[model samples]
Each structure stands twice: as structure tokens, then as C-alpha cells.
Target: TPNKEDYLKCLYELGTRHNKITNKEIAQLMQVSPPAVTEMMKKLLAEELLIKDKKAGYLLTDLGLKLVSDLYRKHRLIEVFLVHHLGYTTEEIHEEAEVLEHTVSDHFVERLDQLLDYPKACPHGGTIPAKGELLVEKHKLTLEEAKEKGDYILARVHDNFDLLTYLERNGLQVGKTIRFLGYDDFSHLYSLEVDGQEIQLAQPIAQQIYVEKI
Candidate 1:
């Protein structure tokens, strides 16, 4: 059985860096303390799953990367089913899949993948990485950036409950065409429109939205 696979998943998502990723970076991303990150990193390194780079922080060994690829595939496939068939919201998909991914067998995941007909992207708009490989998208801008650029399509939204709730209340979702009306830097308020309906968001909330320009 794979051990500490959660940490490997976090490292794959947040700590695969060109320069060395610091304990601080992992800690913040994982919502743990720096000392905790250090302790776990030491453990993973001792297990030969993670390699320490002199200048590049932590790098996943072949074993670590393989585990991530497998777990990530499971996570995303489960997410697709939850969102498409079970009516799970974007905010619900991440944590639900997190709990469910560890309990299921790989064969189960493969069957579910087929049942879902091989979905390409998750509800949050993240591309499902191919088996044993990484996938990267070239461009996405924050909603704040979209405000400056004018019309755009909502490409992705962060997997946070508050932000997702706010977006849902405003009729926002992936594939929606939104127009930026104005922004008040002093008030930290953003004004926008979708489907002839106006929406207002705080700068912090706008920061969570990712969009592609039309």
C-alpha cells in the first residue's frame, strides 16, 4: 500500500517548483506549520519517495511521481463522477474525492472512469492529467485581470466553499461569458456582469476566479 500519499499529492500540486520549494511553501499550501512540513519531508525523504535538491527544494523520486500519478488520476476520475452524476458542486468535489480516493481500489477507479465515459476536465476546470504524466495549461488570468482586459470566459474557480457559494449566488460558473464593468481599488470592490445581470465581488473574492479572454 502507498504511504503518506496525501503529502505526495500536495507536493505534486503545490511544490513541484523550478527552484527549491521551501518548507514554508508546503506548510502554507497544506495549511500546516513549517515544522510539520519539515518533519514529514524528512520522513518521505528517508522512505526514498522524495529527494532533496541542494537548490531546488524537494523533488519527487520516480516512486513518488508514480504514486502521485495514480492517486491524482483516481482523485480526478472520482471528481468527474461526483460533479456530473451525483450533482456535487465544485466546492464539494475536492474534499469528497479526497476522502473517497483512498478507500477505493484502482480497478474500481478504472470502472468508474469508463462509467463516466472518460471525462477530460474536472468541475473546477482543471485538466485531468494523463496516466503517469503531468498536464499543464498555458494561460489563465485572475478575474481582476479579466476586469482590465474586458470580456472573458470563466475558465476556473478555486475550490473554496465561500468563494464557490458566492459565485453560485451570482450565477457564475465555468463557460459563462462575463463582462467587467468596473473596479474600485479604494473600496476593493469589483463590478461585473453575466447574462445581463450585474455582480459585485470583493477583491479577495475576485482573486479566486480564473478566466480566459475572449
Candidate 2:
């Protein structure tokens, strides 16, 4: 009903910043591309949005990056939509805000900013970006990064190090639900459950993941 999935897939391509994967790989990854690669890179560089690093050498990703402002603004903006007005639960808002974030107009963002009376934090405790200004971390965390036992939603996986197939077999994935059963020793690894199976996530593997929570 919304986009019938094709536009969703298309938006997903752009929204993850092409998954930040690699240069030539984006052609295949997006299933298309350009001699326009250098053309586009130079345009982004002309804006100085990206640095000369080109890869590992691409530098200057601290806070204060302008790109974060636009993207983060819309993201937390929709988050404001879902939570306070639409009655969406805070832990349940990520994927919904994601879709709306890519699709909404900048004018729409400003409208909501007024509607919400210019909220700085969108339920989760981070400031929302205000028209090219900061919406700094109300931080996200790693799976092993904290010991709190609760229901958590899988957010991002470490790209190259993803036990991609392994996670699939074990029911761990983006947007899938998981619960930390926590610390019971068959040699004391972290006990995390997905559906019915409780798997022992090795400490480092836990560190290889990030999360959102209910």
C-alpha cells in the first residue's frame, strides 16, 4: 500500500548511505552506477562533505558533520511524530521513523518542528537536529556493551565481521526481536534468546553488535 516494496527497497539503498560498503561495490550493490562515480564524489567533495581519505584515508568524522544534521533531523523528527502524537512506543519507533525519514519533505520536517514546539529530545534522550544544527547522541550501544538484561531490538551489525549467515540461522537480524537472558554459566557466556532458542553469544561476538531496546 505504501510503496509496494520497490520504492522501499530503493529508498533503503540510499538511506543506509549505500550501506557505507565500498566504492566499486556500490555499482553492484545498488545494482547500478556511474562513470559518474568520480563525478559524484567530486561534487560531494566540492561541498567538502567527504574528505580526501577516499577510503581508510577519508578523514574528519567527528561530531559537527553537516550530513548528520539533515538525516538525523528527519529521523528524530518522525520519532517525534510517532511517540508523542501517534502514541507509538519509544522502543518500537526506529524502523517506522526510518521509512518516514527518507520519504518526508524538508518542509514537512519544519512543520513538525513547529507542531512539536521544537522538541530537542525525541523520547530517547538525544537532541534532534534543527536545520543543519546538532542532534547529538542520545547514544546507541553495543550488545556486549552493557549487561542489562531485557528485550532489545537488533540495530546494526558490524559489516565485514557480520556472522551474516550464522546470525540468520540463529534468528538474529536487523529488526528481529531478541532478549538478553543474561549470565548463567555453562562456562559463563552471555545468554541471549531469540524466539525459543537460547544461544551463548561469545563475549567478542556480543561486542560485534549494536542494539535498541524496549
Candidate 3:
């Protein structure tokens, strides 16, 4: 059997994208066959970790969200420690912290948070899930959806390693205020000003960057 915690984490990410998560999506993300996921999904439903939906697919139960929330909290906090104190680069932190999140105790996580002076976001610009906040509430707009000439703050970038490397190299990080200039249909690029210099982003890249109107 695959790790139950891993499924919870995957479900949390999927939940962000869809109102209902299907068996195939889970299989693809986990890189496992559907038969394996079928077995695991059944197990989760039995344990009240998930509830089946007739309309489309599975939804995380309250219990499932609670568990995954804590997991993500630990996951993000560990990333902070790994990058700042342990000399880990952003590229290496996510996978390394994933291994640690499952093994660390609640007390250990709390201590680490304090030691790290209660960091806000992970290296990938994702907000650290807080205790008691079982679901991450997103009132976010992707760069693609943001209005031209509007002032916005760069919030969360997609939690993707390859994307992160490129963003970091190009001076795109969390909390930077940006002004969306416009988009070009022919080039399919977004024009924006960051740090007072103009830069153009490809549509696919803009689609993954979440921002909030300032």
C-alpha cells in the first residue's frame, strides 16, 4: 500500500483545483495505476478520511482536511528551516521537507516554527497553513485574470520546482508589488513591471502566478 499521508497531501492539492476529484487525476498525480488508487480510495472512505460523491468523485472529509492541514503546516515549516538554517536551496527543499513532514511530531513542528520565528510562506511562495484553519481559503486571482494597469501584490506562485527555479532567477518571489500593464494577443505574453523594470511573461507562466489586487 502507498502511504496514507501521501494521499492526504495529494488530495489537498487536488482539492484546490476541483470541486470533485476523480480517480484518474489522483492516479496521474501519484504516478500509480488506477487499481492501486481504487484500493486506497476504498480504504479512505472506510476510515472516514474521504466521502464519495455521486455527481463526480471523491471529496475529503472533515477529518481528512484536518489531517492534511497539519501535514502542510509541517511541510511548509520544514521548508523554512531547511532553506534558512540548514543551507538548503529552494530547488531542493520541497522533496526533502516532504520526507521530514511525515516523520516529525507535532511538538517538533511547533518548536521549529518558533525557532524559525514563525515564517509566513514556503520557498515556493505558498502561505503556510495555520492551525485550526483546515482549509486554505483563496480569494486569489491568477496573473492571467488580473486587470491590466491594476496594482497587485504577488502572492503564491505555483508549487512547482522547475517553475520556481526560473522565477527565482528572474526576480519573481512572493510579496513583491507588481503592476500589470497589458497583454499582447499576437505574442501571447503579459507585460508587467517588477522592481521598476518591465518584463514580459508567457501566458502559461502568468497563468500559474497568483496575485491579489492592492
Candidate 4:
């Protein structure tokens, strides 16, 4: 059930922005390719875990949605447990939870919920899937737009090197609340804040971090 659920969750992520998910995107996300993804999609479709269209992409049905919610709940719960209880790093928790999510039982998940006090969101501010909801839906902003001096916060940083390092070093890290102060008229370099800590970011570096208005 959990493996099935994890596959469904992956499909949901792929299908989120558009009604359909292409084999190319799915392959990239799962670190596979067109042929591998095609085979998997065929199996999932036969099991009613996926609905595929040649031109449109793939969509998940009600059954598929439930599987994602269940697996995500388990995945997030274990992540919480490892971080708060075992002192695991946030970076390590997710990769570890990928395996635990499929292997851990409902009873273990329930216990983890109890231990973590039933958190509504993950450490990175992503919402934990509930019984009915399969994935978190929210607004995202690019670092390039941040140069405009808008009110926002660094919620979750997508995994990108030059961007993440630049943001962190310049105090534009995740959870750092920022209000666009101003920038040089000609370039992307701008002024922002982290937890109210004001700092300046270069145009090239500013192009990396993404944010969400608080």
C-alpha cells in the first residue's frame, strides 16, 4: 500500500501545475527516463493508479489521491520524528524518510503523530498530507522578482547551489522575513531582510533565491 501510495504521490506532484504530467517531467523527477516511465505508467494505469493521455499527460483518480495522502502523512510524520526526536538533520531526514515512508506501518505513523504533537506542516513549511488532501498548494516567487522590493519571506529554498549559498550568506535564508527595500535602478541587486535582519544581495545572487509573501 505504501509503495503504491508513494508512486501516487509522485504522480500528484507531476500533475499539480497542469492537468496532465508528461513522461519527460516524470522521468526527471523520479531520476528515470522515457522508457522506464512508460513501463511504470502502463502498470499503474492497469492498476487504476494512473490515467494517461498521449498528448495531455497523466492524471490520478480518487483512488490514486488517497494513496498519496496516506504515504505523505507517513513520510512527513517520520521526518518530524527523526528531526525532533533523534536530532537528524533536515537534509538527511527527507532522504531517509523516503525509505521509511514505504516500510513504516500505520501503527508506527500514528505513534509518530502522537510524538510530534500532530504537526500541520513540515520543517520546510510544506503541509503534511491529511486524510483527504494529497498535496500542499501554495504560491511561489522567484529571486528575480524579489529584486522588485515586495513584502515576502524566504519559505522554502528549492535545491540550487549558487542560489542557496548566496541567499544563506547574504541573510536571505529560508524563514527569513523580508520586505523589498529598494535596489539599484539598473540591476537586480536589491535590499532585503532576514528575520528583520537587513542585508544587500547582488544582482546575480539575487536571481537565485525564491520567496513567498508572509
- In order of TM-score, best first, we have 3, 1, 4, 2
RMSD of 3: 2.7
Q: Model 1 over residues 1-214: C-alpha lDDT tens digits?
A: 3347878877775653356677777777678867777788889999898897786777888888777777767877887888779998656764576668778998898888788877777777866666667555323577776646468788888666777777778789878898887687686788778998877888778777888878
Give me the candidate number with maximum TM-score.
Answer: 3
Ranking by lDDT: 3, 1, 4, 2
Candidate 4, residues 57-76, lDDT tens digits: the string is: 77677777777777767766
- Best model number under lDDT: 3
Residue ranges of candidate 2 with Cα displaced over 4 Å: 1-21, 25-31, 34-36, 60-64, 82-105, 120-127, 144-190, 193-214
TM-score of 4: 0.70
RMSD of each: 3.8, 8.6, 2.7, 4.8
- Cα-based lDDT at residue 33, candidate 1: 69
Residue 105 displacement in candidate 1 (angstroms): 1.7
Output the worst ten-in-a-row residue range by lDDT, candidate 2. 2-11
For model 2, residues 151-188, the per-residue Cα lDDT tens digits are 98876664322365567667777677788877665665
In model 3, where is the ten-residue run with the lowest total lDDT? Answer: 131-140
TM-score of each: 0.75, 0.49, 0.83, 0.70
Model 1, CA-based lDDT: 0.75
